[PDB]
Amino acid sequence: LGPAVIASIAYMDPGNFATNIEGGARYGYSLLWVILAANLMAMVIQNLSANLGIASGRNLPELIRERWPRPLVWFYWIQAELVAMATDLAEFLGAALAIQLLTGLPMFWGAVVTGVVTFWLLNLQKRGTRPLELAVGAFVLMIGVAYLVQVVLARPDLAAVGAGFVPRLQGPGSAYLAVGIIGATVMPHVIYLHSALTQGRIQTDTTEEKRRLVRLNRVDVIAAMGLAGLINMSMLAVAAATFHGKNVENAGDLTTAYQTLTPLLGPAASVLFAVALLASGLSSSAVGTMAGDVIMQGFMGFHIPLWLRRLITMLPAFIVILLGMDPSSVLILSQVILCFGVPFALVPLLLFTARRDVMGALVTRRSFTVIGWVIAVIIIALNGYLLWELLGG
Numbered sequence: 001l002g003p004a005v006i007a008s009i010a011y012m013d014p015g016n017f018a019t020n021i022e023g024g025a026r027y028g029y030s031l032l033w034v035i036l037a038a039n040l041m042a043m044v045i046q047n048l049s050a051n052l053g054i055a056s057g058r059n060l061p062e063l064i065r066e067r068w069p070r071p072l073v074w075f076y077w078i079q080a081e082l083v084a085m086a087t088d089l090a091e092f093l094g095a096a097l098a099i100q101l102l103t104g105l106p107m108f109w110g111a112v113v114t115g116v117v118t119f120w121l122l123n124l125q126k127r128g129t130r131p132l133e134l135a136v137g138a139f140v141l142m143i144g145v146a147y148l149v150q151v152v153l154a155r156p157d158l159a160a161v162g163a164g165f166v167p168r169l170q171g172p173g174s175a176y177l178a179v180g181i182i183g184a185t186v187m188p189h190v191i192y193l194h195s196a197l198t199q200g201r202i203q204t205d206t207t208e209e210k211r212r213l214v215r216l217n218r219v220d221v222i223a224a225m226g227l228a229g230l231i232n233m234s235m236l237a238v239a240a241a242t243f244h245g246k247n248v249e250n251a252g253d254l255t256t257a258y259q260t261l262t263p264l265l266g267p268a269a270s271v272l273f274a275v276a277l278l279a280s281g282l283s284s285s286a287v288g289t290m291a292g293d294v295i296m297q298g299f300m301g302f303h304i305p306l307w308l309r310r311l312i313t314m315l316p317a318f319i320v321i322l323l324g325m326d327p328s329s330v331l332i333l334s335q336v337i338l339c340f341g342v343p344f345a346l347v348p349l350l351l352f353t354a355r356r357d358v359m360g361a362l363v364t365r366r367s368f369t370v371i372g373w374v375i376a377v378i379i380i381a382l383n384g385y386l387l388w389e390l391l392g393g
């Protein structure tokens, strides 16, 4: 399958559902340009991260640990852990919410059931992961194809669709959801993990052999990112055609998101959406847990036991549940926090991929490094404009 698949399941976590449905319901098609821009940003960034592991032989947390001063390494590890908890917050609550959509249990008992499954998910082997990892990939992909079909059948207003690709914002609320979309697509925890997925996969330590893996990875990433982008744009366009302007109660909330596929799936739309949300949440929550321990091992050299890390990341989920906070609102919030961790992940990535002592003959072309720094400035400005609107005028 490759690393572009383990990536792709992270681009369809409950965080993507929350930002797509809410974005289409609240702002129509006006944010389609964000999904396209963020998806093209991820293509460049994930290619740089993948080329870092192939060329250097180490992941990004390892290179920071071995090259940068100890206090800066500590800071970069702390912020990476905050990114890891925010990542798991959306994925754990997304699965717990899907439990409520399927069984009607309260969110607390949905999290208890989610907690037992995730702890049983760590005690897994390749012969046991294969039927479960293939099944969740089937459920999520089929729902994705359902939105590609539904966007055609829903007859979206093409004039509004076309205008939505023109970069425009509509107050602070549109910036909040746009930053959430960027964080949901350009995920910092995948930035650190993608370099670890490609670091050891080499049959002959040769520049010729390394270039092939770079070329083969570039095709697999762009093909995977193109498909994920079409699905995300379809899901936002279908939610826009379904809720935007209709003045429906709790429009954009994940409790009613199944109504986007009701004209296609009929009565099965509720179960098929909740099953997909559950398979998307359980699989991503295990992927992020495996990524967080790899991130800490790379930064600190050591790691806490896997059961303790799984226990710590559950606490913000139960706190949010006990606080009565709306799950769909905190899934979007977590994606916004993730987008604030993107610039930190990009600075070492852009510096390391431009060095010959790190990359060897595979130094990034000067143009793609410039494009990477432009993406870093755009995201810093977007995060700055958002923090500006949230604190003052």
Ligand SMILES: CCCCCCCC/C=C\CCCCCCCC(=O)OC[C@H](O)CO
Pocket: 032, 148, 149, 151, 152, 153, 161, 230, 231, 233, 234, 237
């Ligand atoms: C902004 C939104 C981005 C959209 C992203 C591209 C989505 C289209 C890709 C595949 C759909 C292929 C399956 C759609 C075919 C449906 C069959 C159909 O249209 O049937 C007509 C019906 O009979 C009444 O005339």
Ligand SMILES: CCCCCCCC/C=C\CCCCCCCC(=O)OC[C@H](O)CO
Pocket: 036, 039, 040, 162, 163, 165, 166, 225, 226, 227, 228, 229, 230
């Ligand atoms: C995710 C990577 C693969 C994604 C592949 C999906 C391709 C869709 C891309 C662009 C569609 C834009 C079509 C251009 C239509 C714009 C119409 C327009 O600009 O309208 C002008 C008017 O002035 C407005 O106010």
Ligand SMILES: CCCCCCCC/C=C\CCCCCCCC(=O)OC[C@H](O)CO
Pocket: 325, 326, 329, 330, 332, 333, 336, 337, 340, 387, 390
């Ligand atoms: C160094 C800077 C990076 C770290 C600091 C910036 C990271 C997040 C910034 C703004 C998001 C704050 C959004 C505030 C929205 C209101 C929160 C709230 O009221 O509770 C949550 C709500 O219930 C459900 O979203």
Ligand SMILES: CCCCCCCC/C=C\CCCCCCCC(=O)OC[C@H](O)CO
Pocket: 037, 040, 041, 043, 044, 047, 048, 051, 055, 211, 214, 218, 222, 359, 362, 363, 364, 365, 368, 371
């Ligand atoms: C909004 C702006 C977003 C920008 C959208 C641009 C579209 C680029 C899409 C895919 C390129 C992915 C490949 C990136 C090239 C990395 C390979 C490289 O530069 O160096 C190769 C070297 O052999 C190994 O390090």
Ligand SMILES: [Cl-]
Pocket: 028, 160
């Ligand atoms: Cl409209």
Ligand SMILES: [Mn+2]
Pocket: 010, 011, 012, 013, 015, 016, 183, 184, 185, 187
């Ligand atoms: Mn995601």
Ligand SMILES: [Mn+2]
Pocket: 253, 254, 255, 326, 327, 328, 329
């Ligand atoms: Mn809700």
